[PDB]
């Protein structure tokens, strides 16, 4: 399973 | 360790041809198991390995929402980086990100990973402590300040030590018949005369898994690293890999050369020689 | 900057004339990701050709596998045609059953 979203924008 | 899980994200801008495309693929060791492409007719996380198909509807919908949300977030990130580098809105750029967990042969977390690149160059990476960052330049420093203020490292660490390891162990069990099976390489040496007094000895390794392998030529017990032509390990298309190493030798001196093969699927390293 | 693709043309299983196999064209080490790859039979583009999902290596360069089923022979010539932003002209790589 992938990293939870939302991720922080760069 | 002996196992790992990795997700690879690629976001690519293309001014004049729509919004940035976002692709994500997931792997357990050298086996891909999922994919998502924002350019698909109807974007949705799709299975790429037999053992992942058993996951329920919630699993796939959860994955799809994450990647659909990421599609939007990475477009924002591309706009941000364009600005950090004072770049024109006319060029195409790419953000790449690799992240995942490594487990020891016992099943314990060995280490976590989270690395990003911009246009093929290292941008920012989470350090092994899973708490601090290493920025490549003043632009990445802006991202670093932003992620430190938002406690991003803490969120990545929580994932890497928790969900990442948990799901990896689950996948390893569900696909144990393949993921936990090493296939040794089938080996042989071919001979190709190049001239009257020189011939090419090519050592082959076929049908092996995982991709990790060591192929070397020795002359009188001395390896020929500098004189050996070693091609990049390549996929066969049936989950296995292929690789070969060649050396040009003097006719009649072939028996002074030996090919050595090391692979996880081999109880003991192999030593081959040309057999006329 | 940019990186030119490495190209390897080979078969999935050892080549046996008249026996169904798989022709592979592995392109790797390139950047950016846009790339055009065609598998050719006697100079003609093969229609049914699939490819793997885009992924990249530790050095961030990309790699893709293009493949199609095929039956080897002594006469039929196979090759892989690759074009990339780093190439001024499309690169042609012929299949050598011993490579």
What lies within 8 Å, CB to CB, of B226 at 6+ separation is none
Specify whether B139 is located in the same domain as B188.
no
Cα–Cα nearest to B163, from B15, B7, B1: B7
Specify whether B169 is located in the same domain as B202.
no
User: Which residues of C fall within a CB distance of 8 Å from B244?
Assistant: 99
Specify whether B8 is located in the same domain as B143.
yes
How far is residue B31's CA from residue B18's CA, in Å, rounded to a whole number?
A: 31
Per the CB < 8 A criterion, the answer to whether B177 and B169 are in contact is no
Q: Which among A5, A8, A9 has CB closest to B66? A: A5
Contact B94 C26 (CB under 8 A): no
Beta-carbon neighbour count of residue B225 at 10 Å?
10
E strand map for chain B: 3-12, 21-28, 31-37, 46-47, 94-103, 109-118, 121-126, 133-135, 186-195, 198-208, 214-219, 222-223, 229-230, 234-235, 241-250, 257-262, 270-272
**To the nearest whole angstrom, how far is the Cα of B166 from the nearest Cα of chain A?**
9
For chain C, say whether B48 makes contact (Cβ under 8 Å): yes
**To the nearest whole angstrom, how far is the Cα of B45 from the nearest Cα of chain A?**
11
Helices (H) and strands (E) in chain A, counts: 0, 0
Chain B residue whose CA is closest to A5: B66
* CATH (domain of C14): 2.60.40.10
How far is residue B188's CA from residue B228's CA, in Å, rounded to a whole number?
A: 16
* CATH (domain of B207): 2.60.40.10
Specify whether B39 is located in the same domain as B154.
yes
Domain boundary among B130, B153, B181: B181
Specify whether B5 is located in the same domain as B41.
yes
Domain count, chain B: 2
Show the DSSP H helices in chain B as ranges. Answer: 57-84, 138-149, 152-161, 163-174, 176-179
- Report DSSP letters for C64-88, one per residue: EEEEEEE---SS--EEEEEE-TT-S
Q: Which among C13, C31, C67 has CB closest to B120? A: C31
Contact B237 C28 (CB under 8 A): no
Q: Which residue has tokens 């994932």?
A: B159
Resolution in A: 1.8
Structural domain boundaries, residue B200: 182-272
Domain boundary among B119, B153, B181: B181
Phi, psi of B60 (to 5 degrees): -70, -40
Specify whether B168 is located in the same domain as B214.
no
Contact B155 A4 (CB under 8 A): yes
Instruction: Examine residue B95 and say whether the peptide bond preceding it is cis (omega within 30 degrees of 0).
Output: no
Q: The tokens of B140 are what?
A: 């990445």
Domain boundary among B131, B161, B181: B181
* CATH (domain of B106): 3.30.500.10
Beta-carbon neighbour count of residue B98 at 10 Å?
21
Domain count, chain C: 1
Specify whether B99 is located in the same domain as B119.
yes
Please report, for residues B103, B144, B178, B265, C84, the alpha-carbon distance to residue B210 in angstroms, rounded to integers and kept in the order given: 16, 35, 10, 8, 30
Q: Distance between terminal CA atoms of chain C?
A: 30
**To the nearest whole angstrom, how far is the Cα of B46 from the nearest Cα of chain A?**
13
* Contacting B residues, span 87-126, partner chain C, CB-CB under 8 Å: 92, 94, 96, 98, 117, 119-122
Structural domain boundaries, residue C7: 1-99
Specify whether B126 is located in the same domain as B187.
no
């Amino acid at each position: 399973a992938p990293q939870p979203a939302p991720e922080n924008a760069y | 360790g002996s196992h790992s899980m990795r997700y690879f994200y690629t976001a690519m801008s293309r001014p004049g041809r729509g919004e940035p495309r976002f692709i994500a693929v997931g792997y357990v060791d050298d086996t891909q198991f999922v994919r998502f492409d924002s350019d698909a007719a109807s974007p949705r996380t799709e299975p790429r390995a037999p053992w992942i198909e058993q996951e329920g509807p919630e699993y796939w919908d959860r994955n799809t929402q994450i990647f659909k949300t990421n599609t939007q977030t990475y477009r924002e990130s591309l706009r941000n980086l364009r600005g950090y580098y004072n770049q024109s809105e006319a060029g195409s750029h790419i953000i790449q990100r690799m992240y995942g967990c490594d487990l020891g042969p016992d099943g314990r977390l060995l280490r976590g990973h989270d690395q990003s690149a911009y246009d093929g160059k290292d941008y920012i990476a989470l350090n092994e402590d899973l708490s601090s960052w290493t920025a490549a330049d003043t632009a990445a420093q802006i991202t670093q300040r932003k992620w430190e203020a938002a406690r991003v490292a803490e969120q990545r660490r929580a994932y890497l030590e928790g969900l990442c390891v948990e799901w990896l162990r689950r996948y390893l069990e569900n696909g144990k018949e393949t993921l936990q099976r090493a296939d040794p390489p089938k080996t042989h040496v071919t001979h190709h005369p190049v001239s009257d007094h020189e011939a090419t000895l090519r050592c082959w390794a076929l049908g092996f898994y995982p991709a990790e392998i060591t192929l070397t030529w020795q002359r009188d017990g001395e390896d020929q690293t500098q004189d050996t032509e070693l091609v990049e390990t390549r996929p066969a298309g049936d989950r296995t890999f292929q690789k070969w190493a060649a050396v040009v030798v003097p006719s009649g001196e072939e028996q002074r050369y030996t090919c050595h093969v090391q692979h996880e699927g081999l109880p003991k390293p192999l030593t081959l020689r040309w057999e006329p | 900057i940019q990186r030119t693709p490495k190209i390897q043309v080979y078969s999935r299983h050892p080549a046996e004339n008249g026996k169904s196999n798989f022709l592979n064209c592995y392109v790797s080490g390139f950047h950016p990701s846009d790339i055009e790859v065609d598998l050719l039979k006697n100079g003609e583009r093969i229609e049914k050709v699939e490819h793997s999902d885009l992924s990249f290596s530790k050095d961030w360069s990309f790699y893709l596998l293009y493949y199609t089923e095929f039956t080897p022979t002594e006469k039929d010539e196979y090759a892989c045609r690759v074009n990339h932003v780093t190439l001024s002209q499309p690169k042609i790589v012929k299949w050598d059953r011993d490579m």
